[PDB]
Amino acid sequence: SKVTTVVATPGQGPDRPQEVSYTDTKVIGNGSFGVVYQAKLCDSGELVAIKKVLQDKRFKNRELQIMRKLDHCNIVRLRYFFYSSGEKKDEVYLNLVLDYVPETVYRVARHYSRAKQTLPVIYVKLYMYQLFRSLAYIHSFGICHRDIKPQNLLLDPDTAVLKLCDFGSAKQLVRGEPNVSYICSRYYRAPELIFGATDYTSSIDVWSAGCVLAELLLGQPIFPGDSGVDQLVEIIKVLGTPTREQIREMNPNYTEFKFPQIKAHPWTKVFRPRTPPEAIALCSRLLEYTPTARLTPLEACAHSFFDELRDPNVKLPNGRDTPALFNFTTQELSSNPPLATILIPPHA
């Protein structure tokens, strides 16, 4: 029954440091700079996850700066932060104390995949819609997450509430200022990142979200491979060889390379026959070579695949209310305010 106290700064609101006490620590995962712990805050009994990141003594940490600015129901909340020692001798670590969420979209997907069963489509709609809302929100600040994948989609399995996490790659993108191409994880990388582009946009997150959607509909990742060349072969087998015009929209240094010559596979044959046609249609507007031809997150939210979510009588299969879906702010709608007519139905 050990109680630990530390002085920490709240993640939002007052900059005043406070004493915070926690107990019941236990290891739950592994981070790039140290183990990840669960703990229970003494004042409230709420569970948190504490993760460590290396403090750069010359630049303030981008993930902290981003997570202090965000406040959205589909983004994991930063409760507190503080500094400590850690795994490497002589180093200072930033500790981010996050609201704990016990499951992920990846766990649910693997659960159904291993059972050889299709994830019910109502859950596919709920998860993807919430993911697109979180993207609309961060993209409205200019922030690109750069590492969208199912393991970074936290899930409360009972309430179906999804929260995007892991902003350790996120960056405010600025047109004309280059960015590293080596972000985003295997299976989920947009083709212009596979091609090494340094001038990409937030539409890389929309490609990754289309990969998540396809994976939930297929029961396995749609573009697997351990090397970019294997991944690209899977992409070309579906989308067909990219044209020179398309390659120039991704990375013009690649226009003249020799690529496998394959005709596009029909989108209706990519998925199993009973896949709902609106889900296929949505996927085809997300997994597009040309980055500017991909839907924006708000446009994806307004897509007819999500119309069931806007029906007054929709419930979860377990009889519960749907989670919050229509509490858009001005900030979140700012890329295109009058999608609100679709987005906020009359009963909301």
Binding site: V27, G29, P102, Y106, R107, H111, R114, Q151
Partner: peptide
């Protein structure tokens, strides 16, 4: 697979 957490109510793999 490659999981975020050590444990899950959905099983192990």
């Amino acid at each position: 697979x490659d999981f975020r957490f050590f444990y899950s109510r959905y099983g192990a793999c």
